[PDB]
Design a protein around this ligand. Structure first.
Ligand SMILES: CNC(=O)CN1Cc2ccc(Cl)cc2[C@H](C(=O)Nc2cncc3cc(Cl)ccc23)C1
Ligand SMILES: [Cl-]
Lengths: 291, 300
């Protein structure tokens, strides 16, 4: 029993964190094999090796080459990381969740779970020096790196890139007028969390009613919720079979929660509808998958 | 900017997790140097749990009855002893990944990271607090016994909790790493039941100072309170009494924001009376109590 915002174990990523210094700027880098990946803003970006100081623990790595790939700088070093895990670089979509290992001076300080918002920002917890901190998921023994932190927006939310340097969202790496778009709630994730509450014994919100997908979406649009697609309904299939509550049956519960509130009640210890757990996260946490 | 429930990086603890099997029971163990620490109930059957005589069950065991697996390697048990509710298995190999560590017993209100494990394999990490009623609101399934709670301040891991059981309300009970339970619980299938839980007042105040630091003051008021009047009101909402120690501990956050502890206490009194009126504090519609004054100073 219990339901927590759970991050993946961070050990495989901790063994890759390094400190990168170029002039007066100091930030974090990801050391995989003989390459250190970090935000290019550490340095018209196109306009020597020894100018880059890379520190792995108490050891100085020697930079023997450098190149740029989109908004990421790739520093060829003379030593391969002996702690390099099995990995892939993957680009995630809004609504997908991931763990963040927040680092300062190449030293990991904390791990937390978060989601890529529909407006492509992340509600992270980062201070100055956190640039280059990374987001990841683990599937079997392979780390899938999906995010590298680049900046904080005026509303206190965060923007970054995939590990190939492509930003998530319409953001650019530089000091200019930038803002996050109006955000929306991740509907498929709220439904997954309502199934998690039912699995944990919280059923006061269930009702005898159902709805069509079209009528539900007319309601979701009104409350700044993302449209629910047939794909989302298919993805919720296993949780629907485990609890015996049809997806459109759970949509009618959500419609009543949106139109009437919680009436002084909570769901999984929360007074707000939670959208940072995917259907896969709910299945994994209520099954015990290990790494 | 931002404020998240943050756990310590789990790597140093992942390198200590092993699987312990005794007969048909399989759970997790913590491998530090040449000793594997695990819940003593690994030697029990389900029937034994009603009234187990651990000393009688243990005397009938030899070293080779305990199977310890570290990754794909079988460790050899060369000795065993019981210390309170923990079994200590002396093994033939010292853990080369043993971090710098201490065993620390925590008090209610203290927070810690939990590395939830199954079959000696870590599956997830989360942050939580020792509740005033000595239970933890964890997320654990069958096979999670032996999962550990810890803090890492600097490069030293301070082990403070080992998971032993789930209570009928879905909450969790366990011991420090010397085998002493937190709370009036026993590693026996008995009634026991968690006592009525209360809100950790010093932690809610710390989190209100975190909201002020991050730029939000909508909840402040022009009032102050005495410590006694605050405690009289707070006890009516099932909040823990605030002591002079808690007031002293909030001193640095009070000096950083310029808001006296008893002035923040007045804002807490008013929040309990009024609710939030459709507003949130650090993205939450409830008053959060699982961040200590130390955690706020660390994260903000
Ligand atoms: C609820 N308990 C049971 O069904 C059987 N239990 C009885 C029992 C009694 C005393 C002691 Cl010290 C340990 C145990 C065992 C126990 O509590 N382990 C579990 C630990 N954490 C989460 C658990 C979630 C689940 Cl769903 C099951 C089992 C968990 C085994
Ligand atoms: Cl403590």
């Amino acid at each position: 029993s219990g339901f927590r915002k759970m991050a993946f174990p961070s050990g495989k990523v901790e063994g890759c964190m390094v400190q990168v210094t170029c002039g007066t700027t100091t930030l974090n880098g990801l050391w995989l094999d003989d390459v250190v990946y970090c935000p290019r803003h550490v340095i018209n970006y196109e306009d020597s090796n020894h100018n880059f100081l890379v520190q792995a623990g108490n050891v100085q790595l020697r930079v023997i080459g450098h190149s740029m790939q989109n908004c990421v700088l790739k520093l060829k070093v003379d030593t391969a990381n002996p702690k390099t895990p099995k990995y892939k670089f993957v680009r995630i979509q809004p609504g997908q969740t991931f763990s963040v290992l927040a680092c300062y001076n190449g030293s990991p300080s904390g791990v937390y779970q978060c989601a890529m918002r529909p407006n492509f920002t992340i509600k992270g917890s980062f201070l100055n020096g956190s640039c280059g901190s990374v987001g990841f998921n683990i599937d079997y023994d392979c780390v899938s790196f999906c995010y590298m932190h680049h900046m904080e927006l005026p509303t206190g939310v965060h923007a970054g890139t995939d590990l190939e340097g492509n930003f998530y969202g319409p953001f650019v790496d530089r000091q200019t007028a930038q803002a996050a778009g109006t955000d929306t709630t991740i509907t498929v994730n709220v439904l997954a969390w309502l199934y998690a509450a039912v699995i944990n014994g919280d059923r006061w919100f269930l009702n005898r009613f159902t709805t069509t997908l079209n009528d539900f979406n007319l309601v979701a649009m009104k409350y700044n919720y993302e449209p629910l697609t047939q794909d989302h309904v298919d993805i919720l299939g296993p949780l629907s079979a485990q609890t015996g509550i049809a997806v459109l049956d759970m949509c009618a519960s959500l419609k009543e929660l949106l139109q009437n509130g919680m009436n002084g009640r909570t769901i999984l210890g929360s007074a707000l509808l939670e959208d940072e757990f995917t259907p896969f996260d709910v299945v994994r946490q209520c099954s015990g998958v290990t790494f």
